[PDB]
Design a protein around this nucleic acid. Sequence first.
RNA 1: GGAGGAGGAGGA
RNA 2: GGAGGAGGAGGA
Lengths: 12, 12
Amino acid sequence: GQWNKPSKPKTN
Amino acid sequence: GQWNKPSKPKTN
RNA sequence: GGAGGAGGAGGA
RNA sequence: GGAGGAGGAGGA
């Protein structure tokens, strides 16, 4: 995991 | 250095 | 949190 | 670029 990790919600 | 590193232009 | 830089809109 | 998560607006 990184931040919001590849849990890409907005998916930046 | 990190990205734009503590070269904080805006300094997000 | 620096190991990415992918990205700066967080900063550290 | 994953080790931070600080931050997700990049994603990798």
